[PDB]
Amino acid sequence: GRRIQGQRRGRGTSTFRAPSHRYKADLEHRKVEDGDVIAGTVVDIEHDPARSAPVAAVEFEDGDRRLILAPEGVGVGDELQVGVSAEIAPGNTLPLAEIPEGVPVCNVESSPGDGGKFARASGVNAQLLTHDRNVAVVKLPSGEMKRLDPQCRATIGVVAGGGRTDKPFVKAGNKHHKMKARGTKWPNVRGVAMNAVDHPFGGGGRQHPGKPKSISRNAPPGRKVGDIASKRTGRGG
Amino acid sequence: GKKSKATKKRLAKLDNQNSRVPAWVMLKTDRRNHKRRHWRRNDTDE
Amino acid sequence: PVYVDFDVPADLEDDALEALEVARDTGAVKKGTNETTKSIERGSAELVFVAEDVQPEEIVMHIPELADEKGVPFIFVEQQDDLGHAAGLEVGSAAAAVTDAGEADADVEDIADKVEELR
Amino acid sequence: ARSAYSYIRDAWKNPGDGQLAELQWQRQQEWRNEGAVERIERPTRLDKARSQGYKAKQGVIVARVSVRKGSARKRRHKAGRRSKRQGVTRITRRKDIQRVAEERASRTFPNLRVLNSYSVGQDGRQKWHEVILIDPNHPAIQNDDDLSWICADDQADRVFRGLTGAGRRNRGLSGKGKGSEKTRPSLRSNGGKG
RNA sequence: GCUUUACUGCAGGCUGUCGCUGAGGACUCUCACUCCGGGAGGAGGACACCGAUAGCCGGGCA
RNA sequence: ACUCGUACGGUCACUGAAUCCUGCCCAGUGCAGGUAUCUGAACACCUCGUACAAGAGGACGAAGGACCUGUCAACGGCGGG
RNA sequence: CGCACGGAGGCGAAGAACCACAGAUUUCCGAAUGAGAAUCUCUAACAAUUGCUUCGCGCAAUGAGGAACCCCGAGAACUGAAACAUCUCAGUAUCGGGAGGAACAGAAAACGCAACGUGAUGUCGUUAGUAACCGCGAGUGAACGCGAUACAGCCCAAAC
Ligand SMILES: [Cl-]
Ligand SMILES: [Cl-]
Ligand SMILES: [Cl-]
Ligand SMILES: [K+]
Ligand SMILES: [Mg+2]
Ligand SMILES: [Mg+2]
Ligand SMILES: [Mg+2]
Ligand SMILES: [Mg+2]
Ligand SMILES: [Mg+2]
Ligand SMILES: [Mg+2]
Ligand SMILES: [Mg+2]
Ligand SMILES: [Mg+2]
Ligand SMILES: [Mg+2]
Ligand SMILES: [Mg+2]
Ligand SMILES: [Mg+2]
Ligand SMILES: [Mg+2]
Ligand SMILES: [Mg+2]
Ligand SMILES: [Mg+2]
Ligand SMILES: [Mg+2]
Ligand SMILES: [Mg+2]
Ligand code: NA
Ligand code: NA
Ligand code: NA
Ligand code: NA
Ligand code: NA
Ligand code: NA
Ligand code: NA
Ligand code: NA
Ligand code: NA
Ligand code: NA
Ligand code: NA
Ligand SMILES: [Sr+2]
Ligand SMILES: [Sr+2]
Ligand SMILES: [Sr+2]
Ligand SMILES: [Sr+2]
Ligand SMILES: [Sr+2]
Ligand SMILES: [Sr+2]
Ligand SMILES: [Sr+2]
Ligand SMILES: [Sr+2]
Ligand SMILES: [Sr+2]
Ligand SMILES: [Sr+2]
């Protein structure tokens, strides 16, 4: 047959690429040596094309103008601090060791100094729970208990733009506009609506898959479609 | 279209190649321009 | 570095090279690793010198273990060019050997004894 | 008596034993951070180099080359192929890693000609070989009675034509009798059956 | 051309084993190696990656 | 490549606005988890064999399979008497 | 005073034309090399990679072409087997790299008419469709030797 859509993706052609040239900034945490004496004033609140959530423009003491991942409540004029001895106020970035337990946190690092990996999407947050000299247990937005290094930096507060998922797209055109700002091919044609040559579920006189949908993990690209290594399917039971 | 200096020289040559076989060559050889090119009927390069 | 098991002090190295300079003008010296090795094997070597900046280390690697089973005393010099200048060459030398000293026999004997005390 | 050279030789008979085991463990850390072809002032194996034709003279260059370990880096067939020709994984190349190393060295030095090469070890993913190259245009070599043969016009690109030592061995030309029916005088004259 | 529990194979995935690979049937360490850090340094660590081989799955492809 | 992206994400599929709803079946097939025991290759190891080798057998036993469980908005099924 | 027999005119005994050898001139693009460009342009140029080095592009090298031949790598399928998978077509077609006027090979860790024998290597004739391979099917297929051609033997590493 012909290569399936998921295989065309990997080649990284224009249709599948993200409009990177239209993106604003790669929202990472600032680099401090030690001492904490790095603070800044919020100049503007901009829209970020990459994540459909707002981003805050901050001007630091040493003359550095950088866009930061905006938590909720952060406005123009507000002073944000980045470092070890930073104040435990929403919008400040300090390592997990210095942040008290039971406090909602965002833009958490995986490895110390990476700039932030977890809890970055609209309105989500990570929850810092247990402390130790070796481990800081953080509960990520998926409900997973992630054991991290207490030296991993994070920003206090929930991410801004909460409740975006609450309002329906209503029409196809609204989806179109959102998708044009992302690295995704849209609309989605069902495999079951294609020809046998194009997809494992293609063909037939009527529309239905040709085999069961639950495919093995060991399946090769071109065959790994439908329900990938499903532990279970359905709602009931 | 916009022609470059070189393209202009080439078009110039093609126009010159389009002139007839002089009257005296007919008398010297005692009796055909095989490269007769029209602007509409024929096509040049580039 | 891999063949070096002891560090020789700057003062002892100064003494050693000065003793080598008067060994070429009076007695006899062998210049170059091949000639130093044959000096140890034949037993004619009184004191053998080895440079520490030899790249590759293979060229000189064998001198310590060979000199130990032939009873020949050895001393490490930090630089290759200093050993070559001491032997009387325009070029450097990875290894040199004093094949029977001369008017330095007392000094060489002290250097041999100072090295054994330094393991 | 034994030469100093014989001790470099004896050390290299077992590169995983003795002082050499420690030396290689150290050197390879620096080598892995080095390039594909690195010119070195002095050969790692003096005995082997001199034995192969090296001289501490002007116009004699040495270079360490790293080539990857393993079989062929082959692409799977994009058209109709019978089962016998459908392989990817078990296919190995006909030229050995030493020969690949020599060619990569000769490309880096377009003016020089390959004299010979030798192995200087390997780790888990790559092999290192040191290639002795010669300048056919330097008068220091043109007057050398032992090396001036390499200056001749027919010795141009000798490595790319298999005229090198590792070339001739890989071409199956070692044996003068039985087994070399399809190798001598050339693989091509014998219909590529060698 | 297309399908599949047709025949035979080939990629790919999973898994054991050998090499890289080191010190003191479960374990400790650090020095290779990997990743994070601008750096200092941190995490991991003889595993993983990679090379080789073996068993299983394998119309994704011939 | 996705990705100047991080689960309110994005990948892979099915169904196809709203409204009222979406029953029963896990035996087969698929996927997934488990597993006393059974089966399960090669290297190393043991026995036999060979002045060596081929080779024969053994011991150990990974994934996988047997076996057990979960799962149908997973492929599908919902009859005769 | 070309092909090319015209008109006008000119050159040639100051020996032209014409031919041989040697030299002068030899635009621009082109490996194309200061940089860019559909043969042009912009403000001193071995660009790039190398060797030597007075460490300065100072001295050199490479690049690209050529009818096929040659050498080193990558390597099909139609086809044959009256199907087809091993096999065959075939190491062929085609592809990548490279030399020369020819290439390659070459002075035995050879042969093994087993010898009290031969004596570097190509190649030609033969050995022979022999030995050998092979769903032991279809097919595949040498060598030693011999008769010829031409003949040529040497240099390092190490010991000292
Ligand atoms: Cl979306
Ligand atoms: Cl070459
Ligand atoms: Cl004979
Ligand atoms: K075929
Ligand atoms: Mg970012
Ligand atoms: Mg788009
Ligand atoms: Mg659709
Ligand atoms: Mg259709
Ligand atoms: Mg299909
Ligand atoms: Mg339908
Ligand atoms: Mg349907
Ligand atoms: Mg006109
Ligand atoms: Mg030939
Ligand atoms: Mg990195
Ligand atoms: Mg098929
Ligand atoms: Mg130019
Ligand atoms: Mg047929
Ligand atoms: Mg038949
Ligand atoms: Mg054949
Ligand atoms: Mg024979
Ligand atoms: Na026209
Ligand atoms: Na070259
Ligand atoms: Na063969
Ligand atoms: Na068709
Ligand atoms: Na069932
Ligand atoms: Na000319
Ligand atoms: Na040049
Ligand atoms: Na220069
Ligand atoms: Na037929
Ligand atoms: Na057929
Ligand atoms: Na066959
Ligand atoms: Sr990032
Ligand atoms: Sr970064
Ligand atoms: Sr279908
Ligand atoms: Sr249900
Ligand atoms: Sr027209
Ligand atoms: Sr020197
Ligand atoms: Sr060339
Ligand atoms: Sr509905
Ligand atoms: Sr089931
Ligand atoms: Sr002869």
Q: Where are the alpha helices (DSSP H) in B1-46?
A: 5-16, 23-28
Cis bond before residue A187 (omega within 30° of 0): yes
Cβ burial, residue D112 (10 Å; 0-12/13-18/19+)? buried
**Exp. method:** X-ray
Residues 6+ away with beta carbon under 8 Å from C51: C60, C76, C77, C78, C79, C80, C83, C92, C93, C94, C95
Cβ(C60)–Cβ(C50) under 8 Å? yes
- The three-state (H, E, C) secondary structure of A5-36, written as one string: HHHHHCCCCHHHCCCHHHCCCCCCCCCCCCCC
Cβ(C112)–Cβ(C45) under 8 Å? no
Residues 6+ away with beta carbon under 8 Å from C107: C15, C19
**CA dist., res. D46 & res. D56, Å (int):** 10
CATH code of D116's domain: 3.40.1120.10
Q: How many domains does chain C have?
A: 1
Q: Using alpha carbons only, what angle is made at residue C110 by residues C105 and C113, rounded to the nearest 5 degrees?
A: 125
Cβ(D11)–Cβ(D18) under 8 Å? yes
**CA dist., res. A146 & res. A135, Å (int):** 10
Q: Which nucleotide is nearest to D110 (CA to C1')?
A: G62
Total length of chain A: 237
Q: Using alpha carbons only, what angle is made at residue A146 by residues A141 and A152, rounded to the nearest 5 degrees?
A: 100
Chain D residues within an 8 Å CB radius of C42? 1
CATH code of C116's domain: 3.30.1330.30
Between strands C45-51 and C74-77, the pairing is parallel
Q: Of C53, C46, C102, C106, which Cα lies nearest the Cα of C78?
A: C53
Cβ(A2)–Cβ(A198) under 8 Å? yes
**CA dist., res. D167 & res. D174, Å (int):** 10
Q: From start to end of chain A, where are the E strands?
A: 39-48, 53-60, 65-68, 79-81, 93-95, 104-106, 126-130, 136-139, 145-148, 153-156, 214-215, 227-228
C-alpha radius of gyration, chain B, whole number: 14
Count other Cβ atoms within 10 Å, centred on residue C51.
22
Residue bearing tokens 């790095």: A38
Question: Domains in chain A, start-ordered, CATH in brackets?
Answer: 1-78 (2.40.50.140), 82-159 (2.30.30.30), 160-237 (4.10.950.10)
Name the 3-class secondary structure at C76.
Answer: strand
Name the 3-class secondary structure at C36.
Answer: helix
Cis bond before residue D43 (omega within 30° of 0): no
Helices (H) and strands (E) in chain B, counts: 2, 0
Chain D residues within an 8 Å CB radius of C54? none
C-alpha radius of gyration, chain D, whole number: 19
Burial A186-221 (b: 16+ CB within 10 A, else e): eeeeebbebeeebbbbbbeeeeebeeeeebeeeeee
Total length of chain D: 194
Enclosing domain of residue D127: 1-194
Q: Of A103, A63, A67, which Cα lies nearest the Cα of A87?
A: A103
Q: Is the CB of A213 under 7 A from strand E?
A: no
**CA dist., res. C67 & res. A40, Å (int):** 70
Cβ(A120)–Cβ(A69) under 8 Å? yes
Residues 6+ away with beta carbon under 8 Å from D145: none
Q: Which of residues 131-150 of A touch strand E (CB under 7 A)?
A: 149
Long-range residue pairs from A216-223, CB within 8 A, at least 24 positions apart, any chain: A221/A6, A221/A7, A221/A10, A222/A3, A222/A4, A222/A7
Enclosing domain of residue C1: 1-119
Question: Domains in chain B, start-ordered, CATH in brackets?
Answer: 1-46 (1.10.1620.10)
The DSSP output letter for A100 is P
Nucleotides of E under 7 A from a protein CB: 1-5, 8-14, 19-21, 32-43, 49-53, 56-62
Q: Could you tell me which residues are beta bridge partners of residue C24? A: none
Between strands D126-134 and D113-122, the pairing is antiparallel
Residue bearing tokens 């065309």: A8
**CA dist., res. D148 & res. D142, Å (int):** 5
Cβ(A80)–Cβ(A74) under 8 Å? yes
Q: Which secondary structure element, helix H or strand E, spans residue C14, and what is its range?
A: helix C10-24
Q: Measure CA of the first residue to CA of the last residue in chain C; give whole Å.
A: 16
Supply A180's token pair.
């044009």
Q: How many CA atoms lie within 13 A of A155 on its CB side?
A: 32
Q: Of A89, A104, A35, A41, which Cα lies nearest the Cα of A68?
A: A41
Closest residue (CA) to C1' of nucleotide G41 is B5
Q: How many CB pairs under 8 A join C and D?
A: 50
Phi, psi of A53 (to 5 degrees): -125, 160
Burial A60-99 (b: 16+ CB within 10 A, else e): beeeeeebbbbbbebeeeeebbbbeebeeebbbbbbbbbb
- The answer to whether residue D46 neighbours chain C at the CB level (below 8 Å) is yes
Q: Of A115, A105, A169, which Cα lies nearest the Cα of A137?
A: A105
Cβ burial, residue D96 (10 Å; 0-12/13-18/19+)? middle
**CA dist., res. D141 & res. D151, Å (int):** 8
Provide the resolution (angstroms).
Answer: 2.7
Closest residue (CA) to C1' of nucleotide G159 is D1
C-alpha radius of gyration, chain A, whole number: 22
Cβ(D40)–Cβ(D62) under 8 Å? yes
Cβ-defined contact of D11 to C61 (cutoff 8 Å)? yes
Q: Where are the alpha helices (DSSP H) in chain A?
A: 5-9, 172-179
Q: From start to end of C22-117, where are the E strands?
A: 29-31, 45-51, 74-77, 95-99
Helices (H) and strands (E) in chain D, counts: 6, 4
Q: Of D181, A124, A192, A28, which Cα lies nearest the Cα of D189?
A: D181
Cβ-defined contact of D2 to C55 (cutoff 8 Å)? no
**CA dist., res. A219 & res. A199, Å (int):** 14
Q: How many domains does chain D have?
A: 1
